[PDB]
Short mmCIF file of all heavy atoms in Angstrom, two decimals:
data_model
loop_
_atom_site.label_atom_id
_atom_site.label_comp_id
_atom_site.label_asym_id
_atom_site.label_seq_id
_atom_site.Cartn_x
_atom_site.Cartn_y
_atom_site.Cartn_z
N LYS G 15 95.56 -20.56 -16.61
CA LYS G 15 94.97 -19.50 -15.74
C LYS G 15 93.53 -19.75 -15.54
O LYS G 15 92.99 -19.35 -14.43
CB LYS G 15 95.29 -18.18 -16.44
CG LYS G 15 94.77 -16.92 -15.75
CD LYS G 15 95.39 -16.73 -14.32
CE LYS G 15 96.90 -16.41 -14.42
NZ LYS G 15 97.10 -15.11 -15.02
N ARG G 16 92.77 -20.29 -16.50
CA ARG G 16 91.37 -20.43 -16.40
C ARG G 16 90.91 -21.76 -15.87
O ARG G 16 89.90 -22.32 -16.34
CB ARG G 16 90.72 -20.08 -17.74
CG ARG G 16 91.19 -18.83 -18.41
CD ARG G 16 91.13 -17.50 -17.66
NE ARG G 16 89.83 -16.95 -17.48
CZ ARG G 16 89.61 -15.89 -16.69
NH1 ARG G 16 90.62 -15.33 -16.08
NH2 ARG G 16 88.35 -15.43 -16.48
N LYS G 17 91.64 -22.35 -14.94
CA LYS G 17 91.16 -23.55 -14.19
C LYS G 17 91.05 -23.17 -12.73
O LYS G 17 91.16 -22.01 -12.32
CB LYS G 17 92.09 -24.75 -14.31
CG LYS G 17 91.94 -25.42 -15.68
CD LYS G 17 92.84 -26.58 -15.77
CE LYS G 17 92.32 -27.64 -14.88
NZ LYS G 17 93.13 -28.94 -14.99
N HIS G 18 90.79 -24.16 -11.85
CA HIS G 18 90.73 -23.95 -10.46
C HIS G 18 92.16 -23.71 -9.96
O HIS G 18 93.18 -23.95 -10.68
CB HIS G 18 90.08 -25.13 -9.80
CG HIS G 18 89.60 -24.86 -8.35
ND1 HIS G 18 88.49 -24.09 -8.11
CD2 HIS G 18 90.06 -25.23 -7.19
CE1 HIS G 18 88.33 -24.02 -6.79
NE2 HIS G 18 89.29 -24.69 -6.21
N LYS G 19 92.29 -23.30 -8.68
CA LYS G 19 93.66 -23.23 -8.15
C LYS G 19 94.15 -24.60 -7.82
O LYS G 19 95.39 -24.83 -7.87
CB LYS G 19 93.79 -22.25 -7.03
CG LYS G 19 93.08 -22.61 -5.78
CD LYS G 19 93.27 -21.57 -4.72
CE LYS G 19 92.52 -21.94 -3.52
NZ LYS G 19 92.67 -20.86 -2.50
N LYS G 20 93.31 -25.46 -7.37
CA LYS G 20 93.60 -26.95 -7.38
C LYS G 20 93.41 -27.42 -8.79
O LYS G 20 93.42 -26.60 -9.76
CB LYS G 20 92.64 -27.61 -6.44
CG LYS G 20 92.88 -27.10 -4.95
CD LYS G 20 94.14 -27.54 -4.37
CE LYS G 20 94.17 -27.27 -2.91
NZ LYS G 20 95.52 -27.84 -2.36
N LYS G 21 93.40 -28.74 -9.09
CA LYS G 21 93.11 -29.36 -10.41
C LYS G 21 94.12 -28.99 -11.50
O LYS G 21 93.98 -29.47 -12.63
CB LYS G 21 91.70 -29.04 -10.88
CG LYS G 21 90.52 -29.72 -10.17
CD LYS G 21 89.24 -29.35 -10.85
CE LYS G 21 88.16 -30.17 -10.22
NZ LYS G 21 86.88 -29.86 -10.86
N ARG G 22 95.10 -28.23 -11.23
CA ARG G 22 96.10 -27.87 -12.19
C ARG G 22 97.21 -28.92 -12.26
O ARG G 22 97.27 -29.79 -11.42
CB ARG G 22 96.69 -26.44 -11.92
CG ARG G 22 95.63 -25.35 -12.18
CD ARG G 22 96.18 -24.01 -11.89
NE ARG G 22 95.22 -22.88 -12.11
CZ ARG G 22 95.44 -21.65 -11.82
NH1 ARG G 22 96.62 -21.28 -11.27
NH2 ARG G 22 94.51 -20.76 -12.04
N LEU G 23 98.03 -28.78 -13.36
CA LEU G 23 99.10 -29.79 -13.53
C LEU G 23 100.15 -29.68 -12.45
O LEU G 23 100.60 -30.73 -11.90
CB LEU G 23 99.66 -29.57 -14.92
CG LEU G 23 100.38 -30.70 -15.69
CD1 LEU G 23 101.86 -30.87 -15.20
CD2 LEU G 23 99.56 -31.97 -15.39
N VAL G 24 100.47 -28.40 -12.04
CA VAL G 24 101.07 -28.15 -10.79
C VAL G 24 100.26 -27.01 -10.21
O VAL G 24 99.82 -26.17 -10.87
CB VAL G 24 102.60 -27.74 -10.93
CG1 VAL G 24 102.86 -26.51 -11.84
CG2 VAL G 24 103.22 -27.43 -9.59
N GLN G 25 99.96 -27.14 -8.85
CA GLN G 25 99.03 -26.11 -8.36
C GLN G 25 99.76 -24.95 -7.98
O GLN G 25 100.94 -24.93 -7.62
CB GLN G 25 98.15 -26.77 -7.26
CG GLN G 25 98.90 -26.97 -5.95
CD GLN G 25 98.10 -27.84 -5.10
OE1 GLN G 25 97.05 -28.39 -5.53
NE2 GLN G 25 98.51 -27.98 -3.86
N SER G 26 99.03 -23.82 -8.06
CA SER G 26 99.61 -22.51 -7.87
C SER G 26 98.52 -21.53 -7.53
O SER G 26 97.51 -21.54 -8.15
CB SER G 26 100.44 -22.00 -9.06
OG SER G 26 99.50 -21.90 -10.17
N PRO G 27 98.71 -20.72 -6.48
CA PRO G 27 97.57 -19.93 -6.00
C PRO G 27 97.39 -18.67 -6.86
O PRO G 27 98.30 -18.09 -7.39
CB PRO G 27 98.03 -19.57 -4.61
CG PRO G 27 99.52 -19.54 -4.67
CD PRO G 27 99.91 -20.58 -5.65
N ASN G 28 96.15 -18.21 -6.84
CA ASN G 28 95.78 -16.96 -7.49
C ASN G 28 96.00 -15.73 -6.61
O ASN G 28 95.52 -14.62 -6.97
CB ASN G 28 94.31 -17.03 -7.95
CG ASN G 28 94.06 -18.03 -9.07
OD1 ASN G 28 94.86 -18.02 -10.02
ND2 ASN G 28 93.05 -18.83 -9.00
N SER G 29 96.52 -15.88 -5.45
CA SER G 29 96.83 -14.77 -4.60
C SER G 29 98.15 -14.14 -5.09
O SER G 29 98.90 -14.73 -5.89
CB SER G 29 97.03 -15.16 -3.13
OG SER G 29 95.82 -15.73 -2.62
N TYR G 30 98.36 -12.89 -4.61
CA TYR G 30 99.61 -12.21 -4.87
C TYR G 30 99.83 -11.19 -3.79
O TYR G 30 98.98 -11.00 -2.92
CB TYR G 30 99.55 -11.57 -6.28
CG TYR G 30 98.50 -10.52 -6.44
CD1 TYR G 30 98.69 -9.22 -6.27
CD2 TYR G 30 97.26 -10.97 -6.91
CE1 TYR G 30 97.69 -8.22 -6.43
CE2 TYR G 30 96.24 -10.09 -7.14
CZ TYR G 30 96.41 -8.76 -6.93
OH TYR G 30 95.39 -7.82 -7.08
N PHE G 31 100.97 -10.57 -3.78
CA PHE G 31 101.22 -9.47 -2.84
C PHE G 31 101.45 -8.18 -3.63
O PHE G 31 101.96 -8.19 -4.68
CB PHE G 31 102.48 -9.75 -1.99
CG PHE G 31 102.28 -10.79 -0.96
CD1 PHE G 31 102.52 -12.14 -1.29
CD2 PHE G 31 101.78 -10.52 0.27
CE1 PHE G 31 102.28 -13.15 -0.36
CE2 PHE G 31 101.54 -11.53 1.23
CZ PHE G 31 101.82 -12.84 0.87
N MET G 32 101.00 -7.10 -2.98
CA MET G 32 100.89 -5.79 -3.67
C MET G 32 101.47 -4.73 -2.80
O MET G 32 101.36 -4.77 -1.57
CB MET G 32 99.41 -5.60 -4.03
CG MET G 32 98.50 -5.57 -2.85
SD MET G 32 96.69 -5.76 -3.29
CE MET G 32 95.95 -5.59 -1.70
N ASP G 33 102.11 -3.78 -3.47
CA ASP G 33 102.73 -2.64 -2.75
C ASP G 33 101.76 -1.44 -2.89
O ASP G 33 101.40 -1.05 -4.02
CB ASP G 33 104.10 -2.26 -3.24
CG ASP G 33 105.17 -3.24 -2.78
OD1 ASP G 33 105.03 -3.78 -1.67
OD2 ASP G 33 106.12 -3.44 -3.50
N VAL G 34 101.44 -0.82 -1.79
CA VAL G 34 100.40 0.26 -1.77
C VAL G 34 101.00 1.46 -1.06
O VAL G 34 101.31 1.39 0.07
CB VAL G 34 99.17 -0.21 -1.07
CG1 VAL G 34 98.25 0.96 -0.91
CG2 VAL G 34 98.42 -1.30 -1.90
N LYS G 35 101.13 2.57 -1.81
CA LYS G 35 101.48 3.88 -1.20
C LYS G 35 100.22 4.55 -0.76
O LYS G 35 99.41 4.94 -1.57
CB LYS G 35 102.18 4.70 -2.29
CG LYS G 35 102.45 6.20 -1.86
CD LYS G 35 103.63 6.41 -0.95
CE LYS G 35 104.90 6.34 -1.78
NZ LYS G 35 106.06 6.91 -1.01
N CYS G 36 100.10 4.73 0.55
CA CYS G 36 99.00 5.46 1.03
C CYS G 36 99.29 6.99 0.74
O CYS G 36 100.39 7.41 0.82
CB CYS G 36 98.84 5.35 2.54
SG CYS G 36 97.45 6.15 3.32
N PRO G 37 98.25 7.75 0.31
CA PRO G 37 98.53 9.12 -0.08
C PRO G 37 98.92 10.05 0.95
O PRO G 37 98.05 10.47 1.82
CB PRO G 37 97.18 9.54 -0.71
CG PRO G 37 96.52 8.26 -1.19
CD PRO G 37 96.93 7.23 -0.07
N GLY G 38 100.16 10.40 1.07
CA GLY G 38 100.65 11.39 2.07
C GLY G 38 101.77 10.91 2.95
O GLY G 38 101.98 11.49 4.01
N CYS G 39 102.49 9.95 2.51
CA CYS G 39 103.48 9.28 3.39
C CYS G 39 104.62 8.68 2.51
O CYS G 39 104.38 8.52 1.27
CB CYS G 39 102.91 8.29 4.40
SG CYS G 39 104.03 7.61 5.68
N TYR G 40 105.73 8.31 3.16
CA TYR G 40 106.71 7.52 2.49
C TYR G 40 106.49 6.02 2.57
O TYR G 40 107.11 5.30 1.78
CB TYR G 40 108.04 7.83 3.09
CG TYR G 40 108.57 9.25 2.87
CD1 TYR G 40 108.44 10.21 3.85
CD2 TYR G 40 109.14 9.62 1.63
CE1 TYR G 40 108.90 11.55 3.67
CE2 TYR G 40 109.57 10.92 1.42
CZ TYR G 40 109.40 11.87 2.40
OH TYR G 40 109.81 13.16 2.25
N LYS G 41 105.63 5.61 3.50
CA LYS G 41 105.54 4.25 3.91
C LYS G 41 104.87 3.39 2.82
O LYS G 41 103.63 3.33 2.73
CB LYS G 41 104.75 4.11 5.22
CG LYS G 41 104.64 2.65 5.75
CD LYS G 41 105.97 2.08 6.12
CE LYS G 41 106.53 2.69 7.41
NZ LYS G 41 107.82 2.00 7.84
N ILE G 42 105.65 2.61 2.06
CA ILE G 42 105.14 1.56 1.22
C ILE G 42 104.65 0.38 2.12
O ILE G 42 105.37 -0.06 3.00
CB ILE G 42 106.20 1.08 0.24
CG1 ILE G 42 106.39 2.19 -0.81
CG2 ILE G 42 105.75 -0.16 -0.47
CD1 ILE G 42 105.15 2.55 -1.62
N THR G 43 103.39 -0.05 1.91
CA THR G 43 102.80 -1.13 2.57
C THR G 43 102.86 -2.40 1.66
O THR G 43 102.73 -2.23 0.46
CB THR G 43 101.36 -0.84 2.96
OG1 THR G 43 101.22 0.48 3.49
CG2 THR G 43 100.84 -1.82 4.03
N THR G 44 103.02 -3.48 2.26
CA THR G 44 103.25 -4.78 1.51
C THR G 44 102.04 -5.69 1.62
O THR G 44 102.22 -6.91 1.71
CB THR G 44 104.53 -5.45 1.94
OG1 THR G 44 104.64 -6.77 1.27
CG2 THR G 44 104.61 -5.65 3.45
N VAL G 45 100.85 -5.12 1.53
CA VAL G 45 99.66 -5.84 1.94
C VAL G 45 99.29 -7.01 1.09
O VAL G 45 99.55 -6.94 -0.21
CB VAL G 45 98.52 -4.75 2.08
CG1 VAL G 45 98.34 -4.08 0.76
CG2 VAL G 45 97.17 -5.35 2.48
N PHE G 46 98.79 -8.06 1.65
CA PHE G 46 98.28 -9.27 0.93
C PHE G 46 97.06 -8.97 0.18
O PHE G 46 96.27 -8.14 0.63
CB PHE G 46 98.18 -10.32 1.96
CG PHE G 46 97.58 -11.60 1.32
CD1 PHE G 46 98.26 -12.32 0.45
CD2 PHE G 46 96.33 -12.04 1.84
CE1 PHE G 46 97.71 -13.52 -0.02
CE2 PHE G 46 95.79 -13.24 1.35
CZ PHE G 46 96.46 -13.96 0.45
N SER G 47 96.81 -9.66 -0.95
CA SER G 47 95.72 -9.29 -1.85
C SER G 47 94.38 -9.68 -1.22
O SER G 47 93.45 -8.88 -1.19
CB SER G 47 95.90 -10.01 -3.19
OG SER G 47 95.82 -11.35 -3.10
N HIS G 48 94.22 -10.94 -0.82
CA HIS G 48 92.94 -11.41 -0.23
C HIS G 48 92.97 -11.17 1.25
O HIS G 48 92.90 -12.09 2.04
CB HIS G 48 92.80 -12.88 -0.55
CG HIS G 48 92.67 -13.15 -2.01
ND1 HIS G 48 91.44 -13.13 -2.69
CD2 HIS G 48 93.58 -13.44 -2.95
CE1 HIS G 48 91.66 -13.35 -3.95
NE2 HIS G 48 92.86 -13.56 -4.14
N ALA G 49 93.04 -9.89 1.67
CA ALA G 49 93.18 -9.57 3.07
C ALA G 49 91.87 -9.83 3.81
O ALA G 49 90.79 -9.84 3.20
CB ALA G 49 93.58 -8.14 3.25
N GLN G 50 92.02 -10.10 5.09
CA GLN G 50 90.85 -10.44 5.93
C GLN G 50 90.76 -9.48 7.06
O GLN G 50 89.71 -9.35 7.74
CB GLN G 50 90.96 -11.87 6.37
CG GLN G 50 91.02 -12.88 5.29
CD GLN G 50 91.23 -14.26 5.74
OE1 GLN G 50 91.23 -14.59 6.96
NE2 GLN G 50 91.43 -15.24 4.85
N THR G 51 91.89 -8.83 7.30
CA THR G 51 91.92 -7.73 8.30
C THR G 51 91.86 -6.36 7.74
O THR G 51 92.06 -6.17 6.56
CB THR G 51 93.21 -7.82 9.16
OG1 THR G 51 94.36 -7.69 8.25
CG2 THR G 51 93.29 -9.19 9.86
N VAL G 52 91.42 -5.41 8.58
CA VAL G 52 91.46 -4.00 8.23
C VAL G 52 92.84 -3.51 8.46
O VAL G 52 93.31 -3.44 9.60
CB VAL G 52 90.42 -3.22 9.03
CG1 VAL G 52 90.61 -1.78 8.78
CG2 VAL G 52 89.05 -3.65 8.68
N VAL G 53 93.56 -3.18 7.34
CA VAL G 53 94.97 -2.73 7.45
C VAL G 53 94.96 -1.22 7.74
O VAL G 53 94.43 -0.43 7.01
CB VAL G 53 95.70 -3.06 6.18
CG1 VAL G 53 97.07 -2.52 6.23
CG2 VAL G 53 95.80 -4.56 6.02
N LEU G 54 95.68 -0.86 8.85
CA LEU G 54 95.85 0.50 9.17
C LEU G 54 97.28 0.92 8.93
O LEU G 54 98.21 0.05 8.99
CB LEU G 54 95.61 0.71 10.69
CG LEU G 54 94.18 0.43 11.17
CD1 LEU G 54 94.05 0.48 12.66
CD2 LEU G 54 93.17 1.30 10.45
N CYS G 55 97.54 2.21 8.62
CA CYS G 55 98.94 2.67 8.39
C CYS G 55 99.50 3.11 9.76
O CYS G 55 98.79 3.35 10.76
CB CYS G 55 98.88 3.78 7.39
SG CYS G 55 100.52 4.37 6.92
N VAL G 56 100.78 3.25 9.77
CA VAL G 56 101.52 3.43 11.05
C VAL G 56 101.46 4.84 11.52
O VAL G 56 100.84 5.19 12.58
CB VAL G 56 103.00 2.97 10.88
CG1 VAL G 56 103.73 3.17 12.18
CG2 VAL G 56 103.00 1.46 10.64
N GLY G 57 102.02 5.75 10.75
CA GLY G 57 102.11 7.15 11.21
C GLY G 57 100.86 7.97 10.88
O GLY G 57 100.26 8.45 11.79
N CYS G 58 100.53 8.13 9.62
CA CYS G 58 99.30 8.64 9.17
C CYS G 58 98.21 7.53 9.24
O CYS G 58 97.91 6.87 8.23
CB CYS G 58 99.42 9.24 7.79
SG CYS G 58 100.53 10.63 7.76
N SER G 59 97.70 7.29 10.41
CA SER G 59 96.95 6.10 10.72
C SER G 59 95.54 6.13 10.15
O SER G 59 94.61 5.93 10.94
CB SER G 59 96.92 5.88 12.22
OG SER G 59 96.14 6.92 12.85
N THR G 60 95.38 6.34 8.85
CA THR G 60 94.07 6.10 8.23
C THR G 60 93.96 4.66 7.74
O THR G 60 94.95 3.90 7.71
CB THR G 60 93.90 7.08 7.08
OG1 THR G 60 92.57 7.02 6.58
CG2 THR G 60 94.91 6.83 6.01
N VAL G 61 92.74 4.25 7.44
CA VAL G 61 92.46 2.88 7.02
C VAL G 61 92.92 2.78 5.57
O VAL G 61 92.72 3.63 4.72
CB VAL G 61 91.01 2.55 7.23
CG1 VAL G 61 90.13 3.69 6.61
CG2 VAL G 61 90.52 1.26 6.61
N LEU G 62 93.56 1.56 5.26
CA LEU G 62 94.10 1.31 3.92
C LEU G 62 93.25 0.51 3.04
O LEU G 62 92.95 0.88 1.88
CB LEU G 62 95.50 0.71 4.12
CG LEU G 62 96.39 0.64 2.84
CD1 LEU G 62 96.63 2.10 2.40
CD2 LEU G 62 97.70 -0.05 3.13
N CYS G 63 92.80 -0.63 3.52
CA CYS G 63 91.91 -1.56 2.72
C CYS G 63 90.81 -2.11 3.60
O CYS G 63 90.84 -2.00 4.84
CB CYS G 63 92.68 -2.71 2.21
SG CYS G 63 93.29 -3.85 3.43
N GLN G 64 89.79 -2.61 2.94
CA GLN G 64 88.61 -3.18 3.54
C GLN G 64 88.62 -4.64 3.16
O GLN G 64 88.73 -4.98 1.95
CB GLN G 64 87.35 -2.58 3.06
CG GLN G 64 87.11 -1.23 3.73
CD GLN G 64 87.11 -1.32 5.23
OE1 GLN G 64 87.88 -0.82 5.93
NE2 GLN G 64 85.98 -1.94 5.68
N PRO G 65 88.42 -5.60 4.10
CA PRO G 65 88.19 -6.96 3.73
C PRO G 65 86.77 -7.22 3.14
O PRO G 65 85.84 -6.72 3.75
CB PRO G 65 88.43 -7.73 5.00
CG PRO G 65 88.17 -6.77 6.10
CD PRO G 65 88.58 -5.44 5.54
N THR G 66 86.72 -7.88 2.08
CA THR G 66 85.40 -8.22 1.49
C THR G 66 85.50 -9.65 0.96
O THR G 66 86.52 -10.39 1.28
CB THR G 66 85.03 -7.16 0.41
OG1 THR G 66 83.78 -7.44 -0.12
CG2 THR G 66 86.05 -7.08 -0.73
N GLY G 67 84.53 -10.08 0.10
CA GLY G 67 84.31 -11.44 -0.24
C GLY G 67 85.45 -12.30 -0.75
O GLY G 67 85.79 -13.25 0.02
N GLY G 68 85.98 -12.07 -1.86
CA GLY G 68 87.22 -12.74 -2.29
C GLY G 68 88.48 -11.97 -2.13
O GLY G 68 89.46 -12.47 -1.54
#
Side-chain angles (χ1 to χ4, degrees):
Chain G
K15 178 63 67 68
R16 314 302 292 171
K17 285 181 70 177
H18 197 73
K19 67 180 176 182
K20 300 289 190 176
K21 286 186 176 179
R22 288 179 182 175
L23 203 278
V24 57
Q25 71 194 6
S26 61
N28 290 316
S29 300
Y30 58 94
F31 288 90
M32 59 198 181
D33 284 328
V34 173
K35 171 80 77 164
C36 185
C39 187
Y40 295 101
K41 181 66 72 175
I42 292 299
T43 317
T44 172
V45 58
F46 174 67
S47 66
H48 298 273
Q50 302 178 2
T51 58
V52 173
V53 173
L54 298 174
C55 187
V56 177
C58 296
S59 68
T60 186
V61 49
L62 191 61
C63 67
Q64 288 296 114
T66 183

